[PDB]
Nucleic acid binder design. Sequence first.
RNA 1: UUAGGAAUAGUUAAUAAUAAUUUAUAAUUUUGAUUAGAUUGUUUUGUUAAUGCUAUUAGAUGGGUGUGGAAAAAUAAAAAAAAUAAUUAAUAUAU
Lengths: 40, 152, 112, 107, 226, 254, 62, 126, 215
Amino acid sequence: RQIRPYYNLPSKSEHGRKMTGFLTPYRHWMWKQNELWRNV
Amino acid sequence: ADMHLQVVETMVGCGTMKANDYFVRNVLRQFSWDSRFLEALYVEYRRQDDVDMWAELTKRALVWTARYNAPASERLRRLIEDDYDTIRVQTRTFRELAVFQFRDVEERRHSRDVVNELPNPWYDYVAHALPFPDRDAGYPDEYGDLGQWRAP
Amino acid sequence: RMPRKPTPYVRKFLEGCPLPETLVDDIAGANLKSMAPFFTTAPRYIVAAESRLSKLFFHHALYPAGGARRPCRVLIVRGGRSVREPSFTINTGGGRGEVGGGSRGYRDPARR
Amino acid sequence: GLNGCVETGRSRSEVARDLGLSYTRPLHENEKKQLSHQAVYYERLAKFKMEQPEAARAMERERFVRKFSGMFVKMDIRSGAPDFPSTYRRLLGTKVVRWASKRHGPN
Amino acid sequence: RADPLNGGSSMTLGSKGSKLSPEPHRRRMPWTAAKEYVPGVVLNARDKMVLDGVQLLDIESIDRASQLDPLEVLRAVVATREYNISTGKNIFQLASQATYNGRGQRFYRKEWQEGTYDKYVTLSAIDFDRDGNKGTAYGYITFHGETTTRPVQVDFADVPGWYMDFVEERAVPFTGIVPPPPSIGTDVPVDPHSYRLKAYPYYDAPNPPEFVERLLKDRGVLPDTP
Amino acid sequence: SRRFRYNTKFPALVSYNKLPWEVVNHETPQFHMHVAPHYEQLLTLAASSPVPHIIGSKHIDVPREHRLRLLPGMLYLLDGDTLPGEFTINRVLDPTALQYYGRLSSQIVTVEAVRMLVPDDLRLLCNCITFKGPLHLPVAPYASLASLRGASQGGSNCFTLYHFVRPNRPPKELQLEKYYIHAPCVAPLSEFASNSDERGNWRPRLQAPKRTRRATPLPAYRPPQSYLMGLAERLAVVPGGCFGRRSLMWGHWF
Amino acid sequence: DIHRLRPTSDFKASFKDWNDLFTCDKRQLRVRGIPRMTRDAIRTAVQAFQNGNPPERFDTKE
Amino acid sequence: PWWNFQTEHRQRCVLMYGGARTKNTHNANHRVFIKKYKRNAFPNRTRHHWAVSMTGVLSQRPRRMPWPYDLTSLIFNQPRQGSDKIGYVVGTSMLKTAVVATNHMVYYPKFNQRVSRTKRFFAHDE
Amino acid sequence: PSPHTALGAVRIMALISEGSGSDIGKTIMFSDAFGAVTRFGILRGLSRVMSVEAFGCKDALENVNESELCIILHFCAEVREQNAAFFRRYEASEEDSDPQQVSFLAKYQQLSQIALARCKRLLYHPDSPRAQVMSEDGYIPLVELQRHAEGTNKAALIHYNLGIRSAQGMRRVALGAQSSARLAELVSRLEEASARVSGNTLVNDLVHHLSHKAA
RNA sequence: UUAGGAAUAGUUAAUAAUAAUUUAUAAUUUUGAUUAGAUUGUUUUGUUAAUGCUAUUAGAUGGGUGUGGAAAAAUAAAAAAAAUAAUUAAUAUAU
Ligand SMILES: [Mg+2]
């Protein structure tokens, strides 16, 4: 399941979900680290 | 492409510093060129005056491997590997190095280990892969018995 | 199918009356299908259920389907009060994000 | 030409066809009428298509409208079955009133 | 497939990736092709807190009794412009205020120039519709020096957040055709002093020390304490 | 019976010639998107190798009955802007339709006018493009464009391409696949040949120079500050949304 | 506290301190009077924090 | 010990469904027949149902089963049952279709005897 | 009148042959025994039968079945056989000043070439998607279903699995026995008497197709 | 399969026939059909000396949507469902 942290981009919309899937570059970097540790 | 490859290798070996222009004008956009074109052209890139021209030409050759769907061979990446102290062009991905270190350290400590050098029959081989067993276990019976009305 | 024990008698087929969903929708105010003419001034009592009353249903409670012009009714909602905590942003952690915004309504009731 | 080929799997008729032999029983008048009247209706339908286009076009149009707008035009296991009242016989009483019986042949 | 992540590797369903191929996974849905997308929820929703205390008017309502004072009309136009600009700048809002509809200029998204990402679009043609904030834009895409051969449709050209720097030397009139900008490897010779590659294949950016500190504090390696 | 000859697998399908979403209209800029890269490679071929019937002295005179049968799919170049008779001249003035000749006009001969010729029966188009010489590409003396006055000289420089297509067809029809022969250009090798006087003025570099200084280091990598879409290595996005392989990720923010 | 049916923040008084929270297994959470989904959420959050993943997820209530 | 085929069938049922069979399926239930119609006024023209009729294709009494040992298995080596058959032509009223009557054997183990039944097929002759 | 489709010209060319069984010689003879044109009314009629609006396109015979192609080739063979002294004089090395005769000769050459091309289409590509026919002004309901629906995404075509299969009558066409045995006669009738029918590479292919499909 | 046994049909084959304007001395059935009744089947159950008698709960579902590869789609304690959520153990549910 794709994790939605609290510090993602919030979608201020009353017609749908309140949080998007747009990350932070720190989240991108740590996801790359976890990707390498799974790649082994 | 193999006809243009000999021309590119001749212009590299003669040291005329014009094989890259021939590769751009004739072989780059209109041929399915493989990776040994850049294995020839890296020696021509090496003979440049300044190191930054060598670096930018190697990086542009890597972008040419990305764009025209011609992946870099092992020999080209090993040619760029040997000059990493001068050019500092990274030629392996972030995934292959993390696999390589964790594999190489484990294989070195496994070869140095004296306990785990013993064979493992669960791991080393498959004992039998045929759909039928190799010797008769007695079954089937092919006859009925008491209380069995359905035969065959 | 389901495993059913065989009986030598007849089988009872019940059509038993459940709690009507339209009844709890009219009580909770979340019907959105009742066309009611003859707008009156008598007040309306609505028992607030769990996650059954929002702005969408309260707008139809103010303006019903009959073509009203003004919310001319007093609306009593039993147990509809909400309590909000103050929200704040987290400076620490992996990034910047605002938490704390939550409603204490419908779960923490008054007068235990 | 009385024995089929076991190797190639040909029939009794195809082996005699490949040998240039004719094994055909003496037909009656109706059996010759069955084999002689196949071309007559084709020449009649081709002459109708060439001679009356304003009627053949309307007939083909209403035939395509009846074919296209049908309910069971999707190729499925039910539409692909050879015998629908025999394979699906539990629908012939309470659901489908097209076929009144479930047996029409030796199967 | 054409392009799988890490080849065939199926110890987990996350090892394949969030999408199995850059092509669409079914033929009947061509909109499921993998492409770079844009956060349209934050961008397309402009701030309505600038239109408060401002009387807007409908288009059809041209009756005399619904007309407003011309000072109120002017502040309504100023508030509507501030509402349209409040999130970002569109392509059609930047090209209207440029000469020759901005043909030949370089448009770019905000995140197209940060990190090791380098990509812009040299504008070639724009068809404005009657609502001039929308339309269809075309251009040559330039990514790390390499350039397309034909003009491609600029995806998300209607979503705001675009930027350009107007250069008079790049302006192409309506009589002539916008030329493709040259590929730095192919067309013009490669010069390290003019353009230097930020990124290349088999290259990854080094780890920032603040990200290293943040990950080692989140994992518990460094002693994070209040 | 008739039902049991074959199965229903792979039935007869409606062709793309009768579907409007598969047929490219010539009043649209999408007509000039498909056919303009075919022209910029044909002029690269005709400037480097002799193409037999690519340049004539006049328009090919087929009879009026054989006009629709033989002419679509045929291309030839003539000198000057002379248009065939029994056609209605429609000049392409749309900048959305003229933008696809950008590589054709910049790196090769400058495009002056693009005209679409529609006949009286509205069944045989002609895409007329008038170029102004000279070529930016080097032209071989044995090439086909050496026999053209507008291409060799540097009114008299104008020459026109003529391509006949059918009006409402899929873009399979307006293809030029027989002209994709890749003939080489001997312009970098003409310096060192026996026909040039520069053959003794170049100096060969048999060894690389000794490098005392290493390469210039890159500037300090600054990470982005905006919200990113996610990991492009698992969203199946190519390395910039443009080209490359997803398995070899590069050129993104990290 | 993310789920509606996992009221994690309603059991602050069921623990002494940080060590009492991080030493209790699921049987001791059953002893203290915590429902099944809530104690499963508490135990998975503790096991994720021990593995290096802090509880940084979006509250999906509204 | 040599286990019978029922052990192998029970093993197959265990590996398929997780368990062999739920117990208490007999129950010794008194199945009573309650008639509704009049004495000789059953709504059928041939078979008048007045008792508990058993339902089952191969699990009824007296028990039948196919007998695979006949002339066809002695003559033809078949890839599957019913692939090759030998019969007599009885009808040629249809075009390119010969009606062929063939015989097969059905075994009664209670009386220990095989009987010859007849099946008609439509064959093709061009 | 001048037909606008190939099918109307096929019907007219069939009515010409069937309306004059033994009078097929006197119907279409417009020339003498020396090559000079006798009656120009028959010439003007036969020129406007094979009109440019009917047989001008390269795919003009795309909806012609195996039975209509026999009518086309029988009409061409009868026109060649009744006026052989005209054709063998004028088509080889003769230039004529009459503007009607050059138009008739061009129309006849175009009709014979597209008829032989359709014969090679039905022979060398049996049941191919490029050998499929359809009805003229045929109802293709997928287009009318896409037009009278609202497409928010035009790539999503409604009733695609049924609309792509169904059009007004559309068959996979291959040459039968009665078609191939007639076309092998008509293609040999299209040539001259001095030509060798052994080296014709289309009659031999039709005969070998007949033998292969009969075996 | 029916304690009191007779007729059946969107019908059979051929076919240059998708989408049958034609041809035929057509097809099923007393070796038991169609309809009506009972009705998931199944060496898994029980009993016995018993090739006998007696039981059964795997399933499927031509008009709800031509979507989808496949309608099986109006509701099932897991079959963990695209970042290692958790994988020490037992309750795993009431809560
Ligand atoms: Mg007949």
